[PDB]
């Protein structure tokens, strides 16, 4: 969907659902549960577009524009207007499409389950991090899709409730130790300063601006201004795919690919330490997410009682990223050696794969007799659990629920 957008990468499901593993003989879907980031969105701040527009205007007035720079003013004005029409930090039309596709594949993947839910009249729960905004709209896209397809399901979908400890823990008191770490830990702060002062930023920043402005114009700017405007342009280039329904402004014209890759790698490095697996032997960045892993288990165990048909949760990257680090999901299994800073070369973690827009985790809970199995979807790819969890059969993506409780330390056996 996009090559160097790290956590702005628009959502694409990572496996065709016709190629999921079939459930073992006589097992049937009895419960499913989901946590999802919001869909694609606009930038939360318009200030970078304006800095660039003001910068472009001065250069226009001085006749210091490149040939392609001529169309920057018109392009960015159009982009900015489209952003403001949707509203800053709001779901785009692509975010709507992302969540509708998730609902579609969920209903197509578990048709027997929704048959049961209607048959039992059990509720489908909708839980949010916040009452309003792009989180609430994200949920609504999904649930109105469930109901447009299956109008007999609609009266069973509950009204949304907010659980900030479960779905907003980086802001609640659950994240207090975490936030104090970001603010005061000297190893962390020095590592982020090291990332920020990587040699390369200045050259990539000048390469970005040189698509629009003459090199003499660039040289007249203050160096810190060069970096700030280039960061802004790259950020806006990076999120442009989120607005694909609203337009195509061809912003790659102004952000050379090697420079895009450079800024992407800086963002991933910072995000790895701030929100991802971070340093070897420390869980400071993701232990807060235990409440969310807990709930995936609690709800699955509670399916036995049969009072809930499904559980749909909606949240931010700041919950999904630590949930993945905590479960050691693919891409989040390698913490950093304090003596070897994260790079693309030595670590598989990437914003774009761990936490694109609408990044989501789903568990399908199957039942035969009183045996309960779980199958995990991550970005709708069927994935194994961490390797000390034993699958139901050799090579299976299905796991005994009491195996998962055991291997996650929740029970002894």
Q: For residue 274, give the nearest of 330, 348, 349 by alpha carbon.
A: 349
Name the residue among 323, 11, 386 with its Cα closest to residue 169: 323
**In the chain, how long is the greatest CA-to-CA distance?**
78
User: What percent of the chain is helix, strand and coil (3-state, nearest 5)?
Assistant: 50, 15, 35
Q: What is the DSSP letter of 277?
A: S
What is d(CA 238, CA 31) in angstroms, rounded to the nearest whole number?
37
Helix or strand holding residue 85 (H, E): helix 72-86
- Can you give the C-alpha Rg of the chain in angstroms? 23
257-274 and 223-239 helices, crossing angle to 10°: 90
Q: CA 6, 10, 16, 20 torsion: positive or negative? A: positive
Closest C-alpha among 132, 148, 161 to residue 99 = 148
Tokens 């073992």, located at residue? 24
Question: What one-character DSSP code corresponds to residue 13?
Answer: -
Query: What whole-number distance in Å separates Cα of residue 372 and Cα of residue 300?
Result: 9
SS3 57: helix
Q: Which two tokens stand for residue 265?
A: 């790698």
Q: What would the 3-class secondary structure string for 202-214 be?
A: HHHHHHHHCCCEC
| Distance, CA of 105 to CA of 142 (rounded, Å) | 11
Output the CA torsion 42→48→50→55 (10° steps).
-150
Cβ proximity of 92 and 41 under 8 Å = yes
CA distances 221 to 67, 91, 206, 228, 260, Å, are: 20, 35, 10, 11, 21
The residue written with tokens 């609690």 in the block is 298
CA distance 105 to 5: 25
3-state SS class at 172: coil
Helix axes 257-274, 186-196, angle to 10 degrees: 180
User: What is the CATH classification number for the domain harbouring 28?
Assistant: 3.40.50.1240
CB distance 180 to 309 below 8 Å: no
Contact 134, 91 (CB under 8 A): yes
Helix (H) or strand (E) holding 183: helix 176-184
Identify which of 112, 167, 170 has the alpha carbon closest to the alpha carbon of residue 312. Answer: 167
Please check whether residue 319 lies inside any domain of the structure: yes
The helix or strand, by DSSP H or E, that contains position 373, with its residue range, turns out to be strand 371-378
Residues 6+ apart with CB under 8 A from 282: 335
Q: What is the DSSP letter of 275?
A: T
The residue assigned the tokens 């996009």 is 2
What's the total number of domains in the chain?
1
Which residues 6+ apart lie within 8 Å of 146 measured at CB? 103, 106, 107, 124, 153, 154, 157
Torsions phi, psi for 5 (to 5 deg): -105, 5
- Alpha carbons 317 and 172: distance in angstroms, whole number: 15
Rounded to whole angstroms, what are the CA distances from 412 to 301, 404, 409? Answer: 16, 11, 7
Which whole-number Å values give the CA distances from 62 to 28, 74, 213, 217, in the listed order?
Answer: 70, 17, 10, 9
Residue 413 located in a structural domain: no
- CA–CA–CA angle 3, 242, 275 (5° rounding): 70
Resolution limit, Å: 2.0
C-alpha distances (whole Å) from 380 to each of 339, 341, 356 are 35, 31, 12
Minimal CA–CA distance to 72: which of 217, 252, 205, 221?
252
Residues in the chain: 413
Is residue 171 a part of any domain in this protein? yes
Instruction: Find where tokens 């960015």 sit.
Output: 76
Q: How far is Cα 217 from Cα 233, in angstroms, rounded to an integer? A: 17
Domain-located, residue 75: yes
Give me the phi and psi of 362, to 5 degrees please: -135, 140
Closest CA to 316 of 3, 41, 13: 41
- CA 375, CA 389: separation in Å to the nearest integer? 12
At residue 194, the 3 state secondary structure works out as helix
**CA 360 from centroid of its chain's CA atoms:** 7
State which H helix or E strand residue 124 sits in. strand 124-128
Segment (H or E) for 312: strand 310-315
Q: How many Å apart are CA 173 and CA 189, to the nearest integer?
A: 22
Q: How far, in Å, CA of 96 to CA of 87, rounded?
A: 15
Residue 369: other Cβ atoms inside 10 A: 7
Residue with tokens 């390698």: 334
Taking the C-alpha atoms of residue 169 and residue 245, their distance in angstroms, rounded to an integer, is: 32
Q: For strands 310-315 and 124-128, give the pairing.
A: parallel
Is 181 a domain residue?
Answer: yes
331 within 8 A of 353, measured Cβ to Cβ: yes
Phi and psi, residue 42, nearest 5°: -80, 165
How far, in Å, CA of 219 to CA of 239, rounded? 28
For residues 364 and 377, the answer to whether their CB atoms sit within 8 Å is: yes
Terminal-to-terminal C-alpha distance of the chain? 43
Pinpoint the alpha helices (H) of 221-289.
Answer: 223-239, 257-274
Instruction: Please give the C-alpha separations between residue 11 and each of 59, 112, 244, 324, in angstroms, as whole numbers.
Output: 37, 26, 12, 17
CA pair distance 79, 73, nearest whole angstrom: 10
Range of the domain at 123: 6-408
Find, among 292, 268, 279, the residue nearest to 37 by Cα.
292
CA–CA separation, 292 vs 169, rounded Å? Answer: 9
Count of alpha carbons within 13 angstroms of residue 195, beta-carbon side: 24
The Cα–Cα gap between 173 and 349 comes to: 27
- Determine, yes or no, domain membership for 1: no
Sign of CA dihedral 324, 163, 11, 32: positive
b/e map of 5-20 (b: 16 or more CB within 10 Å)? Answer: bbbbbbbebeeeeeeb
CA distance readout (Å), 172 to 120, 163, 167, 290: 36, 10, 10, 14
Buried b (16+ CB within 10 A) or exposed e, 230-244: bbbbbbbbbbbbbbb
């Amino acid at each position: 969907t996009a090559q160097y957008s790290t956590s702005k990468t628009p959502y694409s499901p990572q496996q065709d659902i016709r190629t999921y593993q079939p459930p073992p003989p006589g097992f049937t879907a009895v419960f499913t549960e989901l946590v999802s980031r919001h869909g694609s969105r606009t930038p939360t701040k318009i200030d970078g577009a304006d800095l660039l527009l003001q910068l472009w205007a001065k250069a226009r007035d001085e006749s210091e524009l490149t040939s392609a720079g001529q169309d920057f003013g018109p392009t960015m004005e159009s982009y900015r207007a489209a952003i403001q029409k949707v509203g800053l930090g709001q779901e785009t039309g692509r975010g709507r499409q992302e969540l509708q596709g998730m609902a579609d594949r969920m209903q197509r993947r578990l048709p027997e389950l929704f048959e049961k839910i209607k048959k039992d009249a059990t509720p489908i729960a909708v839980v949010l991090s916040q009452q309003t905004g792009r989180i609430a709209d994200t949920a609504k896209f999904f649930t109105a899709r469930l109901g447009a397809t299956d109008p007999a399901l609609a009266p069973l979908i509950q009204q949304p409730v907010v659980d900030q400890d479960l779905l907003y823990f980086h802001k609640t008191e659950r994240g207090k130790a975490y936030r104090d770490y970001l603010e005061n830990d000297q190893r962390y702060q020095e590592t982020v300063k090291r990332i920020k002062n990587r040699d390369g930023t200045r050259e990539a920043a000048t390469d970005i601006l040189k698509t629009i402005f003459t090199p003499a114009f660039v040289e007249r700017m203050e160096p810190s201004a060069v970096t700030k405007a280039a960061q802004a342009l790259y950020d806006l280039d990076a999120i442009a795919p989120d607005l694909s329904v609203e337009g195509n402004w061809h912003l790659d014209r102004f952000v050379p690919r090697h420079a895009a890759a450079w800024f992407a790698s800086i963002d991933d490095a910072k995000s790895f330490y701030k929100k991802g697996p971070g340093f070897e032997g420390s869980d400071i960045t993701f232990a807060m997410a235990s409440i969310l892993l807990d709930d995936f288990f609690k709800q699955a165990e509670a399916a036995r009682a049969g009072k809930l048909g499904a559980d749909l949760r909606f949240t931010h990257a700041e919950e999904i990223i630590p949930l993945a680090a905590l479960m050691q999901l693919p891409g989040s299994e390698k913490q950093a050696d304090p003596d070897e800073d994260y790079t693309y070369a030595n670590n598989p973690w990437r914003g774009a794969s761990v936490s694109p827009m609408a990044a989501n985790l789903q568990w399908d809970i199957y039942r035969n007799g009183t045996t309960y199995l779980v199958r995990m979807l991550y970005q709708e790819k069927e994935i194994p659990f961490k390797p000390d969890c034993t699958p139901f059969t050799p090579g299976s993506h299905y796991y005994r629920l009491d195996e998962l409780s055991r291997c996650f330390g929740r029970t002894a056996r």
